[PDB]
Amino acid sequence: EKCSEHDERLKLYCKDDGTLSCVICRDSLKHASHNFLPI
Ligand SMILES: [Zn+2]
């Protein structure tokens, strides 16, 4: 999961997959559209 420097516990991924743009960290808090990858 990229989503680096941003939440003290949130890290995740979206990318095309039926749901365009989703939780930017399994929740999307203080992220908005930064970036993240899936474990
Ligand atoms: Zn994040």
Curated annotation (Swiss-Prot):
Domain of life: Eukaryota
Localisation: Nucleus
Annotated binding of Zn(2+), by residue: C3, H6, C25, H31
Expression (tissue specificity): At the neurula stage, high expression in dorsal embryo region including neural folds and somites. Also high expression in adult brain (CNS) and low expression in oocytes.
Name of the molecule in the record: Nuclear factor 7, brain
Role summary: Transcription factor that determines dorsal-ventral body axis.
Annotated source species: Xenopus laevis
Modification after translation, per record: Threonine (predominantly) and serine residues are phosphorylated during oocyte maturation, when CDK1 is active.
